Design a binder for these strands. Sequence first.
RNA 1: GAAUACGUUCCCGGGCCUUGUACACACAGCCCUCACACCAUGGGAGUGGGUUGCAAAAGAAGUAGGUAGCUUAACCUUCG
Length: 70
Amino acid sequence: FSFPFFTEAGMLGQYIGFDLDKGMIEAIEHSLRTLNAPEGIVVKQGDILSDPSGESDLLLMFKLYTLLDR
RNA sequence: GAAUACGUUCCCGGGCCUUGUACACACAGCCCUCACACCAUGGGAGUGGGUUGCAAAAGAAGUAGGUAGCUUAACCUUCG
Ligand SMILES: [Mg+2]
Ligand SMILES: [Mg+2]
Ligand SMILES: [Mg+2]
């Protein structure tokens, strides 16, 4: 829900955060219409101690910490 | 200068006693946080032999056996 403040500046591109807890991702992904969260943002599951492959521009690391160095 | 506690179940404080205790300066006891180094142990792709076992092949020296080639002083010579 950082989008209200990410777009307060004008980030409007594809923000897609990847968690693993599906009982938490689906307890927060239903919000798309229930809460009427902005319609310009996707979310998809994924880890990073296993899957850091792709290309993007900004790489938000919030709960990475040293769990990958664990 | 006088209207006059019917009553002690109640941590100003102590005695008698009991069970414990996560107790001995001596009373109370259920994590929120992490890459965690570095010496010791249990492992552990492959390397390598020791010592070699096993299926064999090949066999140096020596010892023994055979042996039509070859060679030779003692013996017998029939004297070839
Ligand atoms: Mg007392
Ligand atoms: Mg041997
Ligand atoms: Mg010989």
